[PDB]
Paper text:
The [name] (M pro) of coronaviruses plays a key role in viral replication, thus serving as a hot target for drug design. M pro is able to process polyproteins to produce several nonstructural proteins (NSPs) necessary for viral replication. The recognition site of coronaviral M pro depends on Gln at the P1 position, and no proteases in humans share a similar cleavage site. PF-00835231 is an inhibitor designed for the [name] of [name]-CoV that emerged in 2003, but its clinical trials were suspended due to the rapid disappearance of the [name] outbreak.
We then used the co-crystallization method to determine the crystal structures of several M pro mutants of [name]-CoV-2 in complex with PF-00835231. The resolutions for these structures are 1.79 Å (M pro G15S with PF-00835231)A, 1.68 Å (M pro K90R with PF-00835231), 1.65 Å (M pro M49I with PF-00835231), 1.72 Å (M pro P132H with PF-00835231), 1.64 Å (M pro S46F with PF-00835231), 1.66 Å (M pro V186F with PF-00835231) and 1.91 Å (M pro [name] with PF-00835231), respectively. In each of these seven complex structures, each [name]-CoV-2 M pro mutant molecule appears as a dimer form, which is also the form with enzymatic activity. The interaction details between M pro [name] and PF-00835231 show that PF-00835231 interacts with several residues, including His41, Phe140, Cys145, His163, His164, Glu166 and Gln189. Interestingly, in the M pro [name]-PF-00835231 complex, the inhibitor covalently binds to Gln189, not Thr190, which is different from what is observed in the [name]-CoV-2 M pro-PF-00835231 complex. This further confirmed the ability of PF-00835231 to form covalent bonds with the residue in the S4 pocket of the [name]. PF-00835231 was found to covalently interact with Gln189 in M pro [name], which is probably due to its dynamic nature. The results clearly showed that the ligand binding patterns are not disrupted by these mutations. The IC 50 value of PF-00835231 against [name]-CoV-2 M pro was 0.0086 μM, while the IC 50 value of PF-00835231 against [name]-CoV-2 M pro mutants, including K90R, M49I, G15S, V186F, P132H and [name], ranged from 1.2 to 3.7 μM.
Numbering used by the authors:
A (entry chain A): 3 to 44, 62 to 301
B (entry chain B): 3 to 44, 54 to 301
Write the structure that this text describes.
């Protein structure tokens, strides 16, 4: 299985550049509003908003947490059906990396439990957005702001609220220690089972609390009830109860794979969600 | 550093659904021609027996009217009475083994996902394709010019995939029949592994570097032993920009790879991988890192 991004065309049509003084970054143009990181300012006639080479006149503005909302005099005719959503650690999304308002590439990312993403961003990438697409509706979840000294990345939702304990200052910040996304590893184990790779199944089970206590001792995220629910479809498809798969993973954590492989790998993958596995296996 | 696909907007505007009888798959709508896999009709006798009205072409909700049809190898060409306004500047190209491209996976004319693939030395690709994905295309983008190089036709019993260029000629020994087909034995794209090692350095991973250099002939001896493709002097040149930026000569990186092949990774990772990755070309690395 492979990391698959959503097609980026609905988001491509919304990317513009925003310039204040000599500082240029990316903005997101939906109807007659352009959203961009507020630090571009580091009056209406001080903002140069361009779609390609064409200027969009700014007629008003305001700040919502760490994002600037620029009111423009043209409604984007390419505006898709969309929502702003705040995602949870473990959830995945596509990133359209942009420079000077021009799309450069698309790739799939996961929100780490410490609210960073392992992205691929260069100078001028701020304002690039992350998103999911469900039945032609684009759910925008991420706007890019920062690269940590460790090389991972940090940003906000489209309401300007950072994910994690970060601030939009030119200061070296540190993420909390990362953990493994348990729910995604389990989805990966279900994907193995769906494809016939099932030697790791055992005849034990566990309670959720007992498993969560053990997981935390291996730097694994505890499972939420929401996690148990989104594993539901894969449990039903394979006939393997979620708590039985937890007991199989626990043995894997306590004994290892020997030299054995799962899905042709010796390392457990944790950036595929239960939805990604359903998306891909069907 | 991530596996990065080209933005797919330009190609999404070209995807349509083609239906003939019981069979449905995807087509590519360029100006006033729809290109799709010919097996949608299931030979020359078979096409003759068909008429323009046997073909149902849908661009979203709108039906397009077919006014002509011809066959070019394994690709069917349907002239339609309407030109696609979203037709980008484009060209049809046949890629070389080792080269990469983005795949826009589509189902029923609707784009579904985008990911990066490489043409394997044995002329397969390791894709992610389900029932209904035939007609999906692979492409590269250069300055608003889309170069189409792949149209999807089949999945081998081993799970890898096979297809044609846009002139309808298969990559590799495959045919568009309902048969179990094996590919030749695959090899690893050496020049791409080196590109990726350079990328791991540019991104701060250095544990695999060593003080040794090798010769090109001696490195190729070891490569051939481990089922790696030969490294040519043209490959050394193409790696010039990455060696220049890191200050590590190509033959020095080759000595690091040789040691990696002979000793293994010893349970360490490179760019989070436990395997030597070979589906990044030198240009891919340069495009992403600069
Ligand atoms: C946006 O492009 C900026 O508008 C840029 C994106 C990063 C550049 C390299 N890769 C990226 O993802 N963002 C920044 O430069 C931000 C700007 C802030 C929010 C005002 N700053 C950082 O990412 C930043 C600053 C510092 C730092 O200081 C001193 C020390 C260490 C790391 C660091 N990152
Ligand atoms: C197309 O979408 C057909 O329109 C379909 C795509 C594959 C199905 C599952 N995943 C895919 O990538 N392609 C096929 O079904 C083709 C059709 C041919 C070219 C007419 N056939 C195969 O991919 C195929 C057939 C057989 C087979 O038989 C016998 C035995 C083993 C493997 C196999 N693959």
């Amino acid at each position: 299985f492979r990391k698959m991004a959503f097609p980026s065309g609905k988001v491509e049509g919304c990317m513009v550049q925003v310039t204040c003084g000599t500082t240029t970054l990316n903005g997101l143009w939906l109807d007659d509003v352009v959203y961009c990181p507020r630090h571009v300012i580091c009056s209406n006639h001080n903002f140069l908003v361009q779609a390609g080479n064409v200027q969009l006149r700014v007629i008003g503005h305001s700040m919502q947490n760490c994002v600037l909302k620029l009111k423009v005099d043209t409604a984007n005719p390419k505006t898709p059906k969309y929502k702003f959503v705040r995602i949870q650690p473990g959830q995945t999304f596509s990133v359209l990396a942009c420079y000077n308002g021009s799309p450069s590439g698309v790739y799939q990312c996961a929100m780490r439990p410490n609210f960073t993403i392992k992205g691929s961003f260069l100078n001028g990438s701020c304002g690039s957005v992350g998103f999911n697409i469900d039945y032609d509706c684009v759910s925008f979840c991420y706007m890019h702001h920062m690269e940590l000294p460790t090389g991972v990345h940090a940003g906000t939702d489209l309401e300007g609220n950072f994910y994690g304990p970060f601030v939009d200052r030119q200061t070296a910040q540190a993420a909390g220690t990362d953990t493994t996304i348990t729910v995604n590893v389990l989805a990966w184990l279900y994907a193995a089972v769906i494809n016939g790779d099932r030697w790791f199944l055992n005849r034990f089970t566990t309670t959720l609390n007992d498993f969560n206590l053990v997981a935390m001792k291996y730097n694994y995220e505890p499972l939420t009830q929401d996690h148990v629910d989104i594993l539901g479809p894969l449990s039903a498809q394979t006939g393997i109860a979620v708590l039985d798969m937890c007991a199989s993973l626990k043995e894997l954590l306590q004994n290892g794979m020997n030299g054995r492989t799962i899905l042709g790998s010796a390392l457990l993958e944790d950036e595929f969600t239960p939805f990604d596995v359903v998306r891909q296996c069907s």
